[PDB]
């Protein structure tokens with residue numbers, strides 16, 4: 001039976017916070033070219049769709065009583081360059097200096113390392129910026145991954161107090177949370193429950209006062225292939241925390257490894273394509289609709305910024321697919337944007353207020369705990385460079401199971417769109433048949449070292465199928481009857497015309513990939529409105545006569561330029577193009593010489 005999706009745009013219910021804008025990984029490798037590319041892709045999600053990168057072993061990037069911060073500087077600057085924040089896990093031994101957190105002097109030295117690093121980056125980036133960072137305890141303390149460090153129950157508590165006092169001495173404004181683990185039923189997860197008991201009821205190692213600061217509680221709960229399982233586990237743990245530790249009733253809860261399945265490197269066909277992408281949206285929709293639409297759930301992070309390894313370019317839990325092309329001179333690296341990363345761009349279009357929506361089948365109302373669901377949102381405009389918007393994101397997802405031999409007939413009924421100037425709608429659609437670079441790779445015979453032409457075909461499947469803007473019917477109503485696949489994503493974007501055109505593209509740079517190829521990366525931080533069709537990229541060889549690069553419509557703030565001719569040397573400039581064909585100002589031109 002067909003699915004009926006109803007959306008009322010006249011009816012703003014409550015805030016829709018973009019609580020999912022995080023990723024992470026575990027490693028220098030963090031400063032390799034591969035990683036610089038990877039982080040360009042992560043940062044290129046439009047409208048700050050990914051804000052934080054939770055990174056393990058950051059304090060192995062420090063060496064030794066004075067510290068050399070060079071490698072940490074390198075990594076944090078690299079994040080900054082892509083407008084990304086560190087999920088700053090205070091994790092590492094500083095090249096083997098720290099070995100024992102029941103050695104009182106080491107605990108004092110740790111406190112000073114932390115205040116020293118916090119002050120350094122307050123100085124380098126400003127207090128306002130570093131105050132946004134989620135400083136965090138050592139990852140998964142109950143999984144015994146400290147290599148050479150001795151971390152007992154008591155040691156962990158000492159370590160935490162050193163973290164807390166270290167950050168505090170740099171500035172009270174800095175935020176610290178933990179433990180970043182599962183919180184299984186006692187006697188399991190002793191350090192995790194032990195931290196809560198310590199912060200709630202224990203004694204500060206340094207000051208001797210009762211209890212210790214804990215600005216947020218971070219857990220890890222993964223789905224074992226079930227989307228709804230993640231939320232169910234979180235509610236059990238959050239309830240236990242609230243009831244056993246009542247001081248933490250309003251303490252924000254993060255699930256900063258909220259993945260469908262544990263084991264990032266385990267190859268899974270469904271991780272390659274829109275199956276994973278659609279499921280990620282489904283997980284988020286379940287959290288918005290079945291929880292936030294109450295415990296203080298504040299952040300959800302898919303831990304998928306890892307780089308993939310041969311022979312699994314697409315099938316690992318990664319935002320990009322890496323190809324190490326070893327038969328060129330020199331060898332080089334190529335990354336492809338996987339649908340999961342593309343989906344984060346679609347999620348980024350969701351605006352600040354949630355709209356009433358209802359999914360039904362044969363008269364039965366279906367909540368987000370079902371294969372078809374929706375998130376609808378609206379934007380209240382501010383200035384002359386802004387206007388009313390609505391974004392509706394519909395998912396069809398059976399979690400990790402793809403169903404290529406199925407169609408899902410949907411009827412979307414949108415109403416209550418208020419009157420506005422030049423109202424248009426734009427649909428963007430994503431599925432495995434049309435938008436899977438893995439799908440194109442398989443169709444090509446899964447070449448180990450794809451040719452330049454093979455990469456172009458693969459990259460042509462990265463973006464969603466976009467339909468040209470169409471004027472909205474009067475009365476603020478629209479009915480669409482798409483044949484969705486399983487998995488699939490469909491965003492309907494409804495935009496009124498802002499009085500002024502888009503802002504300027506900034507931070508444009510040209511990075512070499514290989515002979516005849518480069519990556520153009522830029523920022524959309526000053527473009528303003530989200531009603532963007534694409535970014536017009538222009539190339540000039542002949543002094544300064546500029547020619548647009550024909551390509552699929554894309555709002556991704558990054559583009560690999562690989563022209564058949566190999567002619568890449570010259571100058572480049574980029575601008576935003578809105579749904580009414582109006583351009584924003586061009587970026588400054590950027591030269592490039594091979």
Ligand SMILES: *[C@@H]1O[C@H](CO)[C@@H](O[C@@H]2O[C@H](CO)[C@@H](O[C@@H]3O[C@H](CO[C@H]4O[C@H](CO)[C@@H](O)[C@H](O)[C@@H]4O)[C@@H](O)[C@H](O[C@H]4O[C@H](CO)[C@@H](O)[C@H](O)[C@@H]4O[C@H]4O[C@H](CO)[C@@H](O)[C@H](O)[C@@H]4O)[C@@H]3O)[C@H](O)[C@H]2NC(C)=O)[C@H](O)[C@H]1NC(C)=O
Nearest residue numbers: 027264265266267309310311312316324325326331448449
């Ligand atoms: C082009 O040239 C580059 C060299 O520049 C080359 O890159 C190298 O590729 C290989 C993989 O093909 C990489 O080796 C893999 O590395 C990962 C990660 O290693 C780290 O972590 C492990 C522990 O987690 C440490 O032991 C290790 O020291 C590292 O710190 C490993 O996970 C891989 O091991 C698996 O694959 C091996 C075969 O490749 C198996 O022998 C091994 O048993 C492992 O298999 C198991 O785990 C799998 C997990 O996915 C699972 O699927 C299996 O079923 C099984 O359970 C492996 O060691 C190496 O790091 C790359 N080097 C660099 C510099 O990047 C490309 O391979 C080359 N291209 C071609 C086509 O040749």
Ligand SMILES: *[C@@H]1O[C@H](CO)[C@@H](O)[C@H](O)[C@H]1NC(C)=O
Nearest residue numbers: 062063064067068069070071
């Ligand atoms: C810090 O480490 C880097 C990289 O290993 C090295 O180049 C640099 O000389 C070191 N700085 C100091 C002050 O020792």
Ligand SMILES: *[C@@H]1O[C@H](CO)[C@@H](O)[C@H](O)[C@H]1NC(C)=O
Nearest residue numbers: 228229231232290367369370
């Ligand atoms: C989701 O649906 C299943 C039935 O498939 C049910 O057992 C489970 O309780 C539901 N969970 C939530 C949170 O709605």
Ligand SMILES: [Cl-]
Nearest residue numbers: 259260261317
């Ligand atoms: Cl996963």
